[PDB]
Amino acid sequence: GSRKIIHVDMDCFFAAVEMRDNPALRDIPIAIGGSRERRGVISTANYPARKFGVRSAMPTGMALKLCPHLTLLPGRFDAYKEASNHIREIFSRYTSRIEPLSLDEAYLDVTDSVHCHGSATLIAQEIRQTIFNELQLTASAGVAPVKFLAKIASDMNKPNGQFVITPAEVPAFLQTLPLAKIPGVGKVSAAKLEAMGLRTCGDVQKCDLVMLLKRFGKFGRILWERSQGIDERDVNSERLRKSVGVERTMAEDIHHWSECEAIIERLYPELERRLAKVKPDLLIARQGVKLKFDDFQQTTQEHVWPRLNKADLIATARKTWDERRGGRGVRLVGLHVTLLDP
DNA sequence: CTAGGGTCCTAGGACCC
DNA sequence: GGTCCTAGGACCC
Ligand SMILES: Cc1cn([C@H]2C[C@H](O)[C@@H](COP(=O)(O)OP(=O)(O)NP(=O)(O)O)O2)c(=O)[nH]c1=O
Ligand code: NA
């Protein structure tokens, strides 16, 4: 009853694409991210930049202090999506059991594969080698009996490498595995787990499920399961997008409704264009807006609405502006749509 | 000195029986 | 007791 799961994961995806398409960027620190004047953050960075401490989600101002010579690139999302479509077509050569998680990564369920003598290790190697050919980007991979171990595994031999976890190896791997390494355990959850003396899966194994359920809800059942290598989530190839959003951080805050309305006027065609690619008649389940204020508090307001409509987004943003603002400056404006259920 | 694309979970009151 | 509506938050890429 044991499954073979591969998690395939592109190395420094956006940056690797920019380096292939401009070899001059190979050995200098580079990053995709908005400028400091735009109040941007790092999307990702190459290994020369990471050597200085540059990380995804880091404010560009902090990145540049760590790495004064950092080259900042705007990002070319159609180039990234083209690489994505190609690696996914490569995955299909081995199995239809493909669950994309993002542009640059996917789960593959190769249990019923008879490629490469049924070896998931060699299938993962072949996909990585085929990706390096054909695209001149490198990938890493993880091979495990369940999703989350495969995903942790793909990080352990990166870049351009892989790691395999057999069922016989699962207990020793789990024993000292930090909880923070479990997908879905973030900074807040790890800090809370740490505050009750839980750091590793070995720690959680010695815990009562009932306590975890009280203390954490359904997440605590996930914690109890993962700490034991239990992860029955199937590789699902039939997931569909449920929302589409378009939002903008300004280079400095706005304090007048006229400015907000102007922002909306430029955002709305972008929202309409992306919605129409997937829903030509613009028919939707809800639409709404987002403001992010001075104190970084965020409010959304969204309602049932049959079809993308600019004026109603303006009107509801005006309400949000007047009501839930309380005189602060505004750093971000966003528009949002919730897609119909089929 | 804090993006923009998203997913999933929670929870109170409305609404229904 | 269910289920829908809405707002917010943690989290991932
Ligand atoms: C974590 C992260 C990623 N991205 C974009 C840019 C990344 O290149 C792309 C894939 O995300 P990964 O977490 O896999 O990071 P990576 O750049 O590919 N480096 P890796 O080699 O460690 O996987 O997704 C962002 O825009 N913001 C992010 O916070
Ligand atoms: Na990656």
Q: Is A6 within 8 Å of A143 (Cβ atoms)?
A: yes
CATH of residue A323's domain is 3.30.1490.100
* Two tokens, residue A219: 């997440």
As for how many domains chain A has, the answer is 4
CA of A266 from ligand 2 middle (Å) equals 32
Please name the residue that has the structure tokens 């199995």: A95
Calculated CA dihedral for residues A166, A172, A176, A181, nearest 10 degrees: 10
How far apart CA A130 and CA A300 sit, in angstroms, is: 44
Strand-strand pairing, A105-109 and A98-102: antiparallel
Same domain as A150, residue A7: yes
The residue assigned the tokens 């740490």 is A194
User: What number of helices (H) and strands (E) belong to chain A?
Assistant: 13, 12
| Domain membership flag for residue A248 | yes
| Domain-located, residue A49 | yes
Nearest atom, ligand 1, residue A14 CA: 8
The answer to whether position A288 is within a domain reads: yes
Q: What is the largest CA-CA distance in chain A?
A: 66
> Ligand 1: residues whose CB is within 6 Å?
A 9-14, 43-44, 56-57, 104, 158-159
Using CA atoms, how far apart are residues A151 and A15, in angstroms rounded to an integer?
Answer: 21
Strands of the sheet containing A71-73, edge to edge, are: A42-45, A30-33, A71-73
Statement to judge: residues A6 and A128 lie in one domain: yes
Please state, in angstroms and rounded to a whole number, the distance separating the CA atoms of residues A235 and A107.
7
Centroid of ligand 1 to alpha carbon of A34 (angstroms): 15
Query: Does residue A121 sit in the same domain as residue A151?
Result: yes
A49 Cα: distance to centroid of ligand 1 (angstroms): 14
My answer on whether A143 and A212 are in the same domain is no
Is A7:A102 a contact under the CB 8 Å cutoff? Answer: no
Whether the CB of A331 is less than 7 Å away from nucleic strand B comes out as yes
| Calpha distance A42→A29 (Å, rounded) | 12
- C-alpha distances (whole Å) from A146 to each of A61, A180, A220, A268 are 39, 18, 19, 42
Considering the domain boundaries, does residue A207 fall inside one? Answer: yes
- Per the rule left: phi > 0, alpha: psi between -120 and 50, beta: everything else, A134 is left
Q: Please give the full DSSP string across A5-50, using - where no structure is assigned.
A: EEEEEETTHHHHHHHHH-GGGTTS-EEEE--TTTT-BEEEE-HHHH
Q: Could you identify the atom of ligand 1 that is nearest to the CA of residue A155?
A: 22
A105 is catalytic: yes
Cα(A181)–Cα(A156) distance, rounded to whole angstroms?
A: 11
- Assign A278 to helix, strand or coil: helix
Closest to A277 in 3D by CA, of A337, A220, A196, A211: A337
Of the residues A105, A134, A232, A272, which is catalytic? A105
Say whether both A33 and A60 belong to one domain: yes
Q: Where are the beta strands (DSSP E) in A69-188?
A: 71-73, 98-102, 105-109, 139-144, 162-164
The full length of chain A comes to 342
Token pair 């109890």: residue: A224
Angle separating helix axes A310-322 and A257-278, nearest 10 degrees: 140
Amino acid identity of residue A332, one-letter, is: L
CATH number at residue A85: 3.30.70.270
Known binding-site residue numbers of A for Mg(2+):
9, 104
CATH no. for residue A48?
A: 3.40.1170.60
DSSP alpha helix (H) spans, A176-285: 187-195, 201-205, 209-216, 218-226, 257-278
**Side chain identity, residue A186:** G
Closest CA to A8 of A178, A126, A165: A126
Range of the domain at A220: 176-230
Chain B positions with any atom < 7 A from a protein CB: 1-11
Q: What is the CA radius of gyration of chain A?
A: 23
Give kind and range of the element (H or E) at residue A81: helix A77-92
- Asked if A71 CB < 7 A from strand C, the reply is no
In this complex, the answer to whether residue A178 has its CB under 7 A from any atom of chain B, a nucleic strand, is no
